[PDB]
From Swiss-Prot, chain D:
Expressed in both the central nervous system (CNS) and in non-CNS tissues, including the kidney, lung, bone, heart, liver, spleen, sciatic nerve and blood. Expressed in brain (at protein level). Localizes at the proximal ligature of the hypoglossal nerve. The lineage of its organism: Eukaryota, Metazoa, Chordata, Craniata, Vertebrata. Keywords: Cleavage on pair of basic residues, Disulfide bond, Glycoprotein, Growth factor, Secreted, Signal. Belongs to the TGF-beta family. GDNF subfamily. Transmembrane segments: none annotated. This is Glial cell line-derived neurotrophic factor. The keyword Glycoprotein applies. It comes from Rattus norvegicus (Rat). The gene is Gdnf.
Amino acid sequence: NRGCVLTAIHLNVTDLGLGYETKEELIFRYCSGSCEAAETMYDKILKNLSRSRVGQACCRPVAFDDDLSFLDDSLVYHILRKHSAKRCGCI
Amino acid sequence: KNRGCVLTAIHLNVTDLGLGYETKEELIFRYCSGSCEAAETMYDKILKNLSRSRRLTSVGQACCRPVAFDDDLSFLDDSLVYHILRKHSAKRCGCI
Amino acid sequence: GCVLTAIHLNVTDLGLGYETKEELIFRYCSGSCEAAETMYDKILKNLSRSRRLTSDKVGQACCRPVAFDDDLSFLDDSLVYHILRKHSAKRCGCI
Amino acid sequence: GCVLTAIHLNVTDLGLGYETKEELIFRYCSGSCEAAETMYDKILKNLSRSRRLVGQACCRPVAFDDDLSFLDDSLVYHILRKHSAKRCGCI
């Protein structure tokens, strides 16, 4: 499913909408694209049961980037975990 | 918590699966379906926020899928040929 | 835990005496209710655990439908319409 | 089947940890609810008998008794709210 791909966008942590005030920036990566091909027995049978008579697979992160630690303007440090995709896949 | 993501069971003949098997084997096939509107990860919260801000239009959203699969099903078909179905039926559903 | 699960069935499978080939997806509520939301439930759980009350799980909370799916309609073999109301769960809760 | 039962208990029988000599009348709902009021319960019963399948109606409080205040072996007053049934119903 090569249509399911990873895209990177350069953002400020403040663009994440998490309510933090900081100058930290990051490259945010996300998954998008089609998952029209069956990658498991389960999806094959889901299809067949349609052509016979939802739950379709989706392009999502299967691996996440490393933790990102940043300093707030309020002196509090924060760690974002599983906030950005490292690898994408149909699941 | 996306309570709408549920497991649904259907009793089928393995021949109902359209996999080409010639057997009398039957099984309870289970599949996952339902809504996953609620963000369950930092990643999904961010996607919701970037869509609202128009920096990334609503990307693959989380979907209701199996998080666990029933055990492998081994059987001999009508010609005594051995076959195994792996990750063919849902055991547990989750927004992923 | 209390969750909604579903099963594909034939209307005939319901045992209501209908003669039809129509099917449906029946959804139901099942699971335990171990959280006591009121003092009454906390007391029943304590009385039960201390054996001051004997009945298995005397009056404890049950996993039940708190909302129902749309009503099911179908035509039987005699070409008579039937509507099954509040026949399937849409949401489950410990009550 | 589903009825209210009133019994005389010591507050200490409740297992709330409070040391006291106070008592109370505790009323609870119990009994069978094998009457299928809704199509849903009719169906559950049929699926259980046909071994096709799961929780049928249960006898529960649909109304509660007034609050009960009680004194501890200390300077603190305690109050029990919705701790005793006043009316029962199969739900």
